[PDB]
Ligand binder design. Sequence first.
Ligand SMILES: NC(=O)[C@H](CCC(=O)O)NC(=O)c1ccc(-c2cc(-c3ccccc3)cs2)cc1
Ligand SMILES: [Ca+2]
Ligand SMILES: [Ca+2]
Ligand SMILES: [Ca+2]
Ligand SMILES: [Zn+2]
Ligand SMILES: [Zn+2]
Length: 159
Amino acid sequence: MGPVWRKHYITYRINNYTPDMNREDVDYAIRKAFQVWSNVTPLKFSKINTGMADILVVFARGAHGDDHAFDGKGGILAHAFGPGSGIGGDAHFDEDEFWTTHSGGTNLFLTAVHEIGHSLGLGHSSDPKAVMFPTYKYVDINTFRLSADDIRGIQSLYG
Ligand SMILES: NC(=O)[C@H](CCC(=O)O)NC(=O)c1ccc(-c2cc(-c3ccccc3)cs2)cc1
Ligand SMILES: [Ca+2]
Ligand SMILES: [Ca+2]
Ligand SMILES: [Ca+2]
Ligand SMILES: [Zn+2]
Ligand SMILES: [Zn+2]
């Protein structure tokens, strides 16, 4: 076992917003990506705007203060730290991508589902249909479902 949150109530804060999307569409995409994971575990997520959030969502570019710089458009789309205090849990999105609500550019909701997986403690899947597969794939958002391998992974950590 990798690190896991020791509690089932987890807060998140959106540190800043990409100018690529409307603020409301970023909030929705993030809220829906947490909901994917809450639907198969005992976890609950609440958004705060001040105070001490466990998972900070950041948009940043290039070398942005942790050891893992971003690489411009393409390649690394985002990354996240596993459960822990401070930077633990935090999910950072490369502003050099073009974030969207749809199939164009890079879909924020799907990328956030994957990154939130890492923020909760998952590694990668070798199942091509699992959201935790190492490479991005757009899949129809309205019918999106976690694969059984994703659900096995997250239920092996939280129950
Ligand atoms: N390519 C990279 O270097 C980074 C490394 C950081 C990480 O692995 O989080 N990876 C990504 O940027 C990244 C990888 C996968 C995904 C996504 C995979 C899927 C997906 C959906 C259905 C089936 C398979 C994958 C949607 S987003 C998003 C970003
Ligand atoms: Ca944190
Ligand atoms: Ca990039
Ligand atoms: Ca951008
Ligand atoms: Zn980072
Ligand atoms: Zn990943």
